[PDB]
Nucleic acid binder design. Structure first.
Lengths: 117, 56, 110, 26
RNA sequence: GUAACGGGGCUAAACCAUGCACCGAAGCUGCGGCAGCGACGCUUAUGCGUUGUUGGGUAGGGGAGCGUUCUGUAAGCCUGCGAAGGUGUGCUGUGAGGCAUGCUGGAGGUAUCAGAAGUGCGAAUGCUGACAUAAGUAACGAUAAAGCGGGUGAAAAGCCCGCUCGCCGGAAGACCAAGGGUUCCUGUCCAACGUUAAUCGGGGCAGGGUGAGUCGACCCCUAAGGCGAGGCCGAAAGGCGU
RNA sequence: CCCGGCGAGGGGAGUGAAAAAGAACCUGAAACCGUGUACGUACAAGCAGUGGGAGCACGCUUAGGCGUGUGACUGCGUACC
RNA sequence: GUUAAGCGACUAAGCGUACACGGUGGAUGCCCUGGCAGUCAGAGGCGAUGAAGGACGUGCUAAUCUGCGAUAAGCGUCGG
């Protein structure tokens, strides 16, 4: 009839404190602070799961721009020419080719320039 | 006047970094008796620089 | 071989004893004794007595030859506290803590 | 010998202070 | 403190007109997964298919669940070849959660389906215990004052002897009453107590010590005042008085 | 039996299934305080995390590479009731 | 080999994170001659032959509980 809260409370506190390893100071030792730290970490993870895609597309565009100017044309006209030639390669593959294969990228630039002119 | 926040264990440790002690780093050996002592002090049986001081 | 001596419920705060402890951490016993002989601290006496007891234990029970011993480990822990009362002005009262400590010394021929 | 015992005192305080003028008086 | 472009800088990297590119959101599209509500079929009943559409949310309304302690099923099942509890690791579910196993521990625990609640805590200047910070900081309680030689002892500024020095002296001297209740003296000990050490103590322990015809209580006598047989008053209890 | 003040506290020996059951004694969690090992840190400005990410150490692996710990540098970011 | 110019590991007074081993403290689990609520019976008073409640004593015994009262952890008699 009388119920004691001894074991369940310990289980919950240990569960929360386990996923606060590596945090500085009282944020990994004391329950009250650790709970807030874990909640805020969850919110940040949710938001950054969306920021990641923007960041990577930005990086790819920058690298493609550099390579295209190396071959004598800017990014905007380059992808306009690629659209006019009906090529469907996306930006991740283009950046990978630009870094790792200097001849295929030159061929693509030639094709885009021919289609544009 | 009193603090507004509890200072941490890191700050407490940093303040104590100047609290260490130093050893004498060396002793002297009496010429005759051969026992050790501080420099410019007499030995435990009243010797100093070979002579035999009172040794009460 | 490892030999241990301890002093429990020593009447001194652990913070004050830790200052003397690290003067001898890792030294040969022969020079540690004379280092402890010339430090003007209360805790030096306690630490020296513990060290001598450890040397005697190592020599009598296990193998002899105190000429090849080193201080391998030494540390100080906190013991129980005693609580008292000190009267202050205007009828207030305050709590006083009298702290103790435990002392452990390990010597080794290796 | 080597056994210790003690008690406590808790009469707290008896206020009635702030003998200086009021902070933002009349 | 530049301080009335966010800065650097700009004579176009400013303003007007025209045009074409590109960048840019959790909006839209592509790929995978979940759930609610309809319509239509099959089961022709649970359910199973085809589609269409919806899924930000405080006060608040509606619907489904997890875990804890007790009763039945229980003289059943698990367990000294190791139970509850504590402490790690690995799997698993949308969640509250579940399962397995290494170390510690040394005797109890309960599938499933039902029943009852002292059934789930971060906050209430909440209650009780333990432990931090400021900090090895402030202070060590009258500015009458101390120096040296010997002893004892594990250890002597403070204990015991000795010689000097200083302080009080209508008191800081000597007797009492009130109040206290062994603090008195001797031998032993130094854990705790003494605002430091202590061999010392009004501290611990064990023995010892207070002798009255004349001192004082008791005793005889009464003051202020108290109590008061009978008595006089008053719902009771009681009030006042010889 | 040994160190020590004919101390307090220890170290052996012995009893016991067990002494990490030694009387401050079943089990012994948390805050709090230490010793040891790996990595980082003395030209750097803010709720101390989150996304990206070299280098180092250890373990496995038949290269391929994984796993664990730490984390230089960098985008975003003003606790809870 | 010497000059220049450029670039640059190795330090830890102390501090952080992770792991290993400890100290302090007394939660958790498991216990119970201690309590709580009842049912069925019994008894519903003791005292001038001195009560309820106490003080002081009493042992081979310093003390404190439990008994007992100068006949003092007890005296007589009838039963087990």
């Amino acid at each position: 009839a009388r119920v004691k809260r001894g074991v369940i409370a310990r289980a919950r506190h240990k569960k929360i404190l386990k996923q606060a390893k590596g945090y500085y100071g009282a944020r990994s030792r004391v329950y009250r602070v650790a709970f807030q730290a874990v909640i805020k970490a969850g919110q940040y993870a949710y938001r950054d799961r969306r920021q990641r895609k923007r960041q990577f597309r930005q990086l790819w565009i920058a690298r493609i721009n550099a390579a295209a100017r190396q071959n004598g044309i800017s990014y905007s006209k380059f992808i306009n020419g690629l659209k006019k030639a009906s090529v469907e390669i996306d930006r991740k593959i283009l950046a990978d080719i630009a870094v790792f294969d200097k001849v295929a990228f030159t061929a693509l630039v030639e094709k885009a320039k021919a289609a544009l002119a | 006047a009193v603090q507004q926040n509890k200072p941490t264990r890191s700050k407490r440790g940093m303040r104590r970094s100047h609290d260490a002690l130093t050893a004498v780093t060396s002793l002297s050996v009496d010429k005759t008796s051969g026992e050790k002592h501080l420099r410019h002090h007499i030995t435990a049986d009243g010797y100093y620089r070979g002579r035999k001081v009172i040794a009460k | 071989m490892e030999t241990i001596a301890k002093h429990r419920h020593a009447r001194s705060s652990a913070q004050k004893v830790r200052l003397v402890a690290d003067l001898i951490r890792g030294k040969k016993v022969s020079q540690a004794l004379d280092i402890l002989t010339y430090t003007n601290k209360k805790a030096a006496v306690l630490v020296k007595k513990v060290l001598e007891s450890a040397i005697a234990n190592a020599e009598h029970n296990d193998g002899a030859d105190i000429d090849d011993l080193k201080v391998t480990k030494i540390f100080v822990d906190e013991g129980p506290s005693m609580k008292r009362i000190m009267p202050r002005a205007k009828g207030r009262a305050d709590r006083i803590l009298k702290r103790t400590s435990h002392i452990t010394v390990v010597v080794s021929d290796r | 010998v080597a056994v210790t015992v003690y008690e406590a005192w808790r009469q707290l305080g008896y206020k009635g202070s702030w003998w200086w003028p009021r902070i933002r008086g009349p």
